[model samples]
Target: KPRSLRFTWSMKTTSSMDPNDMMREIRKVLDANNCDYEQKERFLLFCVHGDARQDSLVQWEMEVCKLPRLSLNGVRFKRISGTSIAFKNIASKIANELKL
Candidate 1:
């Protein structure tokens, strides 16, 4: 059986930066540390922010979702900012939906 894990967390954001850029930077650091991020079967990044930039992050995620894949694997993206508490609670629940 394959062990599975879900990544759920909020990323701090600034107006001059897109959440995707921050995500890319995160990937780079993980890559340097020998983290096999690309080998994951499923990935989801739920960006939480209260700003006009949220619109662009969703658009960027959609574009990434369009890329060709050799297998049925890709990252799912969502944007939420109504309440930080609600975001964390709901996001963490998905981990229970999957069984390793």
Candidate 2:
């Protein structure tokens, strides 16, 4: 069967001028997890997993958004949650099909 998981987030970027720094913040979190990044669709993509992924989200919420240098007259960030699905193996796929 397929495995189900939930990814919750409260993340946003305020200053367009600081996408580079914001990306640094993201890289900081991923560095802890040894995650990879690529520029796709003008978006920085990280295939993160486990506690490190969670940590990245937390960093984005608590640390990155609170940068003192990025203050006054700029864009803002907010938090939200999301969902994703994964199938580990054929057995899992079969199990999910049976469950359905």
Candidate 3:
């Protein structure tokens, strides 16, 4: 079974800079969303680098999201398309809404 608590977060990123810069932005978004200490340290990043290199950039993003660690239990990111995306939080509930 999956973790009881779940939280999903997202960010709209720009396609400009190397993998390092892209990672920096991802860190910023996670930080702003208040990810837990451990999750923050091992945050997952996936996104394109720039419009000109979008095809390649998005491919890289997909690859990053496929990492086993990223999809473990804490957090995960998935790309829906060029300007759309989705995420899943199965281990952490820092940003989830409860029905009960």
Best candidate according to TM-score: 2
Q: What C-alpha lDDT do the candidate models reach, one value each?
A: 0.31, 0.31, 0.32
The whole-model C-alpha lDDT of candidate 1 against the native structure comes to 0.31
lDDT of 3 by residue, 42-99 (tens): 3333333324444322212221122223332233345434432222332122223211
The true-versus-predicted C-alpha distance at residue 85 of model 2, in Å, is 9.1
lDDT of 2 at 27: 48
TM-score, structure 2 vs. true: 0.30
Candidate 1 residue spans exceeding 4 A from truth: 1-72
Evaluation by TM-score, superior candidate among 1 and 3: 3
lDDT of 2: 0.31
Backbone clashes for every candidate come to: 0, 5, 3
Off by over 4 Å in 2: 1-17, 41-43, 50-100
Residue 14, candidate 3: alpha-carbon lDDT:
19
Q: Rank the candidates by lDDT, best first.
A: 3, 1, 2
Clashing pairs for model 1 are none
